[PDB]
Design goal:
The structure is cut from a larger assembly and holds 1 copy of chain A and 2 copies of chain B. Chain A is built from 1 helix and 12 strands; from the N terminus they run E-E-E-H-E-E-E-E-E-E-E-E-E. By secondary structure, chain A is mainly beta. The N and C termini of chain A lie far apart (53 Å). Chain B is mostly loops. Chain B contains no helices and 2 strands. Chain B has a two-stranded antiparallel ribbon with strand order 1-2. The two termini of chain B are 38 Å apart. The chains are: A mainly beta, B little secondary structure. Chains in contact: A-B, A-C. At the A-B interface, loops of A face loops of B. Chain C: It comes from Shigella virus Moo19. Chain C: This is Major capsid protein. Chain A: This is Ig-like domain-containing protein. The PDB classes it as virus.
């Protein structure tokens, strides 16, 4: 939830965090989710601020209005982001990785945003089971399986949670073909 | 029915959307009625079987 | 309570959505056969056995 507050004169729609503090001269104009649930990408903070400004009034930002008096001129409004960014996973795990026994698969992720302390934790699901076993050790952004065997195949998932609790997730399937035992 | 379609590209791309990634096909019309003789329009109200 | 109504002063007050479904079907293989031996054809009482 991102709380937007808009000012009448400087046309500054400060997009603060949910538990923020509306600055002087600005009035609360609404609240929207940046990581929109049904469409995570393809939507940007700029889109959230617009729809909130499509219900206000040009005469006065409070006392909401509509199309003939709404604030549609997005060119004049300046969006001064003062809130934490998304935990965008720039490079996610490969969807499927193919290897032979004795090989080595180095799974990687790069995270940008959130609060300063980023926590990395990995998880492993058995190749036919349904419960997610917790990978011991790890606690890093790159898992390296060496001399991988036919027992270590399956689905490996990493979950990057920050100091706030906005976790982004990514999964990878590791199919290591081998002669049957 | 008047229907206006603006395909994405160099048609629906203003300073509020410089890339042109949005279209629409609004269809609007006008309708009105004039009951010259309402006494000749009868209804009957009754329940229906399940 | 849901009829679309439009004021003369502009729009963006009636947006609709659409959905599409999928139907599927699958194929299967059949067959059968019989054996026979030359004699059974050139020694049997009936000429048109084959």
């Amino acid at each position: 939830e991102l709380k937007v507050a808009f000012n009448k004169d400087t046309y500054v729609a400060t997009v603060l965090d949910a538990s923020g503090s509306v600055p002087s001269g600005s009035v609360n104009v609404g609240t929207f989710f940046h990581p929109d649930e049904t469409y995570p990408d393809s939507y940007v903070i700029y889109h959230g601020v617009r729809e909130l400004l499509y219900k206000r009034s040009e005469v006065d930002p409070a006392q909401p209005g509509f199309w003939p008096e709404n604030i549609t001129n997005m060119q004049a409004v300046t969006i001064d982001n003062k809130a934490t960014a998304r935990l965008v996973l720039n490079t996610s795990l490969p969807r499927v990785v193919s290897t032979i026994e004795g090989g080595k698969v180095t799974l990687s992720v790069v995270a940008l945003g959130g609060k300063a302390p980023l926590k990395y934790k990995w998880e492993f699901r058995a190749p036919n089971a349904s419960t997610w076993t917790a990978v011991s050790g790890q606690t890093t952004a790159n898992l390296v399986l060496d001399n991988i065997d036919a027992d270590k195949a399956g689905e490996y998932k990493v979950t990057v949670t920050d100091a706030a609790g906005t976790s982004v997730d990514s999964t990878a399937l590791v199919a290591v073909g081998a002669y049957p035992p | 029915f008047n229907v206006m379609t603006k395909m994405p590209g160099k048609e629906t791309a203003d300073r509020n959307d410089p890339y042109g990634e949005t279209g629409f096909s609004s269809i609007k019309w006008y309708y009105g009625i004039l009951v010259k003789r309402p006494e000749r329009i009868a209804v009957m109200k009754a329940v229906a079987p399940l | 309570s849901k009829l679309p109504l439009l004021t003369e002063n502009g729009g963006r007050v009636n947006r609709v959505g659409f959905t599409r479904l999928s139907r599927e079907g699958s194929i299967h293989k059949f067959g059968f056969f019989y054996e026979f031996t030359q004699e059974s054809l050139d020694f049997d009482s009936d000429d048109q056995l084959k």
